[PDB]
DNA sequence: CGAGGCCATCATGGCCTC
DNA sequence: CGAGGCCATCATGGCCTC
């Protein structure tokens, strides 16, 4: 039922590092449409986001975003966990920023909302 | 009997990469005193070496050297294998150049020969 | 082909601080 | 302590060529 990773199509644009203290500035979260609508507003505010888009991903929503400062993926996961409870919530750092966004606007993906195009 | 790696004291200065196409310019070979005396002259010539020292390492000899151009560790191993046969021959790339040399001049290590100090 | 170069990418982990 | 930043190091592997 609930996804356990991102969609194969996306997996190459993503960091899967487990033992890294690396900070980055582009992230994506996979969760339910309604949790993603909430996190859109909350994440935008928390991280003074430079950009943030919400996307349809299969039965669900992918939040994509970039931040003025860097964060550990863990830190953003710990932040989102404080806002609500989630059936699933998968939070991953984005290695290939432009290519993640492009594909999430493309298909089987749609834009729902975004602070620019 | 014959060593199967370099001495623990040295292991941190060394590359242990198995699946890398990386080229570098500083190497060390662990082998018998007599194979090392041979490779000293031969390695110097083959690689137009910028520097090369031979060292006493326990019952044995460590060849240390730097090259004007870069090489895969594998390439230098393949070269040394063409010169003779060896009871053991351990060829490794050197990550920390200065610190490898310093320690090999230090102790339980001595210089035997070197194209400078 | 496969030996032996090139490079960009990014995970590892040491370190530091509130 | 331990969350969450910083960075330098260097292994991975894609690519290319004789």
Distance CA B6, CA B63 (A): 12
Distance CA B57, CA B30 (A): 8
**Under DSSP, is residue A32 helix (H, G, I), strand (E, B) or coil?**
coil
The string of DSSP letters for A49-109 reads -SEEEEEEETTEEEEEEEEEEEE-HHHHHHHHHHH---S-EEEEEBSSHHHHHHHHHHSSE
Distances in Å between the Cα of A20 and the Cα atoms of A10, A15, A64, A73, A100 are 21, 10, 21, 10, 21
> Which two structure tokens, joined as six digits, stand for B57?
């390492």
Tell which residue, B99, B82, B102, B114, has the closest CA to residue B13: B99
CA of A71 to C1' of C14 (A): 18
Distances in Å between the Cα of B6 and the Cα atoms of A24, A93, B35, B63 are 37, 38, 16, 12
Distance CA A99, CA A94 (A): 9
**CATH top class, domain B1-117:** alpha beta
CA of A39 to C1' of D13 (A): 36
Residues 38-97 of A with CB under 7 A from strand C: 93, 95-96
H helices of B5-96, in order, are 33-46, 73-83
CA of B95 to C1' of D9 (A): 9
What angle, rounded to 10 degrees, do the helices at B73-83 and B33-46 form?
A: 120
**Under DSSP, is residue A5 helix (H, G, I), strand (E, B) or coil?**
coil
Which residues is chain B interrupted after (C–N above 2.5 Å)?
Answer: none
What separation, in Å, do the N-terminal and C-terminal C-alpha atoms of chain A show? 32
Instruction: Quote the longest CA-to-CA distance of chain B.
Output: 35
Query: Quick one: CA dihedral A73, A75, A76, A77, positive or negative?
Result: positive
A54 touches strand D (CB under 7 A): no
B95 touches strand D (CB under 7 A): yes
Method for structure elucidation: X-ray
Residue B97: how many CA atoms within 13 Å on its side-chain side? 11
CA of A34 to C1' of D11 (A): 41
What angle, rounded to 10 degrees, do the helices at A73-83 and A33-46 form?
A: 120
Q: Where are the beta strands (DSSP E) in chain B?
A: 24-31, 51-57, 60-71, 89-93, 109-114
Chain D positions under 7 Å from a protein CB? 3-15
Contacts of B75 (CB under 8 A, 6+ apart): none
Contacts of B2 (CB under 8 A, 6+ apart): B87, B88
Per DSSP, what are the bridge partners of residue A55?
A62, A111
Place of tokens 């620019």: A116
The residues spanned by each domain of chain A are 1-117
Please work out, in degrees rounded to the nearest 5, the angle formed at the alpha carbon of residue A32 by the alpha carbons of A26 and A33: 85
């Amino acid at each position: 039922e609930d996804p356990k990773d991102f969609p194969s199509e996306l997996l190459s644009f993503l960091s899967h590092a487990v033992f890294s203290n690396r900070t980055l500035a582009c992230f994506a979260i996979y969760t339910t449409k309604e949790k993603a609508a909430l996190l859109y507003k909350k994440i935008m505010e928390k991280y003074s986001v430079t950009f943030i888009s919400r996307h349809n991903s299969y039965n669900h929503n992918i939040l994509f975003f970039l931040t003025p400062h860097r964060h550990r993926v863990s830190a953003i996961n710990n932040y989102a966990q404080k806002l609500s409870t989630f059936s699933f919530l998968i939070c991953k750092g984005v290695n290939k920023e432009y290519l993640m966004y492009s594909a999430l606007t493309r298909d089987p993906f749609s834009v729902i909302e975004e602070s620019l195009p």
